[PDB]
């Protein structure tokens, strides 16, 4: 009925806005536009909280946005993303990564491993060796478990190992994944309609 049809239209539009915001968040992440990312993050969060129902596809979209936000805050060790205050931002990203309904291909495994490694490295670069060991215990598996344990034990913050499995390396692999999400939803309604309006003026 009238009110019901309006409510359905609102649900449809909310779904469109979620997709569009995800796309915008991915681009800001890719381009390194930190302030735009923060603002788009707040918008996406508001739209998500306003949803009264979700489809599996939307849940995946939500996870993707949550994942990127945790990654963007990877070095902000004082940021609490989970109810359990002990969980660091990268550990939170790791949990989300392991929940997303996606294929565990090579890129997936590469990202997973790099996040596990950097979750420990960011703590060590802050001189927080006790916290690094605590992160290790919570996370640990991979073939580098023993090496990480040793690196932590010896407080070897700038071990060559980290030079290879660096934060930048982690970021570039995730940006590769973002390019995939980007191409996958660059055709969602809102973005497509807006692009059409922009072109319809040229």
């Amino acid at each position: 009925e009238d009110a019901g049809l309006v409510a359905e239209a609102e649900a449809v539009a909310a779904g469109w806005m979620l997709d569009f915001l995800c796309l915008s968040l991915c681009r800001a992440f890719r381009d390194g536009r930190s302030e735009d990312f923060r603002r788009t993050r707040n918008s996406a969060e508001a739209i998500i909280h306003g949803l009264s129902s979700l489809t599996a596809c939307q849940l995946r979209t939500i996870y993707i946005c949550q994942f990127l936000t945790r990654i963007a805050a990877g070095k902000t060790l004082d940021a609490q993303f989970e109810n359990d205050e002990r969980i660091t931002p990268l550990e939170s990203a790791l949990m989300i990564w392991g929940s997303i309904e996606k294929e565990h291909d090579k890129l997936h495994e590469e990202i997973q491993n790099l996040i596990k490694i950097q979750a420990i490295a960011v703590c060590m670069e802050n001189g927080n060796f006790k916290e690094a060991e605590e992160v290790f215990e919570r996370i640990f598996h991979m073939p580098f478990k023993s090496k990480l344990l040793m690196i932590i034990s010896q407080k070897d913050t700038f071990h060559s190992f980290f030079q290879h499995f660096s934060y930048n390396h982690m970021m570039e692999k995730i940006k590769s994944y973002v390019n995939y999400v980007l191409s996958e939803k660059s055709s969602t309604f809102l973005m497509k309609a807006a692009a059409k309006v922009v072109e319809s003026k040229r």
Partner: peptide, 13 residues
């Protein structure tokens, strides 16, 4: 809790 994108608060470091 919640589908939070932003932090829930500050963490004890």
């Amino acid at each position: 809790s919640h589908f939070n994108l932003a932090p829930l608060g500050r963490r004890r470091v």
